[PDB]
Design a protein around this ligand. Structure first.
Ligand SMILES: [Zn+2]
Length: 56
């Protein structure tokens, strides 16, 4: 009962599975219901919905 992987190189949002767009030091969610923004902290990206930031 192995967990699904499907190439870990595939880009997909944390929960709102959809295309992601990198911008400078922040990541922007792209897709139909996407639009959330995730800033990089200490060189580490944020994949938490609660910490996700809304469009400026
Ligand atoms: Zn997304």
């Amino acid at each position: 009962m192995p967990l699904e992987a499907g190439l870990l190189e595939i880009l997909a949002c944390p929960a709102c599975h959809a295309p992601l767009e990198e911008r400078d030091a922040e990541l922007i969610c792209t897709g139909q219901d996407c639009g959330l923004a995730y800033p990089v902290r200490d060189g580490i990206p944020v994949l938490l919905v609660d910490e996700a930031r809304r469009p400026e």
